[PDB]
Amino acid sequence: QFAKPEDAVKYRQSALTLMASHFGRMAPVVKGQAPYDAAQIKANVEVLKTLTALPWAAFGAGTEGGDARPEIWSDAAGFKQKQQAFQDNIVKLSAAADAGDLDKLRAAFGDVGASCKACHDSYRK
């Protein structure tokens, strides 16, 4: 869907940005600093879940640029793995949310977060 590499870059960064917001916004709740409303959380996770599938398609060959390390392309299999483990954690998050269990959510939240970090460690400049 992209004409220039710059456009894929702009797209993926935007998706990542949005996702960061949707995920990050739950930290105070998960930490107990904000009240917990199951329904609100559930809806937010639904959005997050949609957003989380988006970025991956904008890292095709020829989209080199931004803060993407070249290893994303040299080591595609490793990148796919990182991405899949991440989506899997999203699924867990989603299940915790659906169930309305703060403990579960809290734990899953940590798992997801570690997933973000794992990817960044190997593939983000």
Paired residues of 68 in beta bridges: 124
AA letter at 36? Y
Scanning 5-13, 25-33, 34-42, 94-102 for contacts with ligand HEC by CB under 6 A, the matching segment is 5-13
Cα–Cα distance between 48 and 29 in angstroms, integer? 16
Binding residues among 12-31 for ligand HEC as defined by CB under 6 A: 12-13, 16-17, 19-20, 23
Shortest Cβ 5–ligand HEC spacing (Å): 10
Annotated binding-site residue? 67: yes
82 near ligand HEC, judged by CB under 6 A:
yes
Cα–Cα distance between 120 and 20 in angstroms, integer? 13
Cα–Cα distance between 71 and 52 in angstroms, integer? 21
45 near ligand HEC, judged by CB under 6 A:
no
Given a contact cutoff of 8 angstroms between Cβ atoms, the answer to whether 94 and 45 are in contact is yes
Residues that bind ligand HEC (CB under 6 A): 9, 12-13, 16-17, 19-20, 23, 66-68, 82-83, 86, 112, 115-116, 119-120, 123-124
